[PDB]
Assembly symmetry: C2
Homo-oligomer: 250 residues x 2
């Protein structure tokens, strides 16, 4: 199932639209009793969507795999993982913080479902991660306490920067269905995809845009280096003020 | 869970499996996935207890994953994950009218496309960044190459499309403590547990000084966003000038 629990958490919350108009609290359940003893359930039968919690991420995965785009009284089904409600980004992490540590530190704010540290295709800490709370109230606190205060995790004072999680969708995307529903759209369609030939407006334009784009890049990278350099110096600055005062008392 | 005539045995369908016993053979492997239908392609480092198999379908591979990951097998628990796409690009500067379908249409031109998607926010509005997945790497190089060489346009509006290699991040496995390298620089960061620093201490002053450098950095970068935006709108009307009246001579 899932050893050492993390049962019936928001990561086991699935969503389902395109419910036919004749649906009960009970028929829903009957649809997902294959995958065991359900948790919190919600339906707005009016608007033909519903939510369900399963015991485990795995069950939720299988359910989803099994019940997506399958019929129920004419209607094909929309199974999706539900977007977590109590989720923060964290940044400025010591390369030496672990998923475990980050979870540990954050529990001081209320029960945690999960906490992860985002890693590169080389598995190196990217310096960001996610913290996922059970409830929202805990996430409120976290985000407040940490904006108001200075939360540190390791010896070297790296202050945690905590933001609300921005949630992107890269699975559904922008389907044609929804696209067409726009005026500018049909105009934008009229001229197909293409490489633009030297000689045309399109050309001299985009070559120039490209340049502006390249510039912006350098500009941005330049800023990052400045402020990088600033940040390293500030180390070498404060030292004097304080560290030296601890070599005077000693 | 399926759609007749949906291109099958894609990279979206490739599973990696670690922690196989060193006494594994091809034929043990294919039967572990016996229940998930007709096995596609297989590779195995028998010396390194790891391997890959393609299945028919995303939905299958999901279930296989959910089912087998962490399952015991002659001593070890298997690690089973989705294999990291090898033929994948980031694309940016999308008119928010471009769609998954289009993006696919547009890039097929380079080679067969496993999948093309536009990344949409919570409001379902395009963010102008999107992903393109090819069957093969050639397809992805050729598509990067032309597109850095040339200028590639999608729509009547000449928004030129930028292509990068797709930077692949892990938010699943993450960085477990086990994996944290118990080098010196390790326990020595841990010597001091989590805490809020107190007003007056060094930890504090440093950290608030840092914070300010941080928010500065922010603003400065938003500023560059602002600068260039304007330059880009100036360029727009500029060009509309140098030409629409060449178009007025063509009227
Ligand atoms: Mg009831
Ligand atoms: Mg009830
Ligand atoms: Mg505890
Ligand atoms: Mg930075
Ligand atoms: Mg420890």
């Amino acid at each position: 199932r899932r050893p050492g629990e993390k049962t019936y958490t928001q990561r086991c919350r699935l969503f389902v639209g395109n419910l036919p108009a004749d649906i009960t609290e009970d028929e829903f359940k009957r649809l997902f009793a294959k995958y065991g003893e359900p948790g919190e359930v919600f339906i707005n039968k009016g608007k033909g969507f519903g939510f369900i919690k399963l015991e485990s991420r795995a069950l939720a995965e299988i359910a989803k795999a099994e019940l997506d785009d399958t019929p129920m009284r004419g209607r094909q089904l929309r199974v999706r993982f539900a977007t977590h409600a109590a989720a923060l980004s964290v940044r400025n992490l010591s390369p030496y913080v672990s998923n475990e540590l980050l979870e540990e530190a954050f529990s001081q704010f209320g029960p945690i479902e999960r906490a992860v540290v985002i890693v590169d295709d080389r598995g190196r800490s990217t310096g960001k991660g996610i913290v996922e709370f059970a409830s929202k109230p805990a996430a409120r606190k976290a985000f407040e306490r940490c904006s108001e205060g200075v939360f540190l995790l390791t010896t070297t004072p790296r202050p945690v920067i905590v933001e609300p999680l921005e949630q992107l969708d890269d699975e559904d995307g922008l389907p044609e269905k929804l696209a067409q529903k726009n005026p500018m759209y049909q105009k934008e369609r009229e001229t197909p995809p293409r490489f633009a030939q030297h000689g045309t407006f399109e050309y001299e334009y985009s070559q120039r845009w490209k340049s502006l784009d390249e510039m912006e890049k350098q500009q941005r990278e330049q800023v990052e280096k400045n402020m990088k350099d600033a940040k390293d110096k500030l180390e070498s600055e404060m030292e004097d003020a304080y560290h030296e005062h601890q070599a005077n008392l000693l």
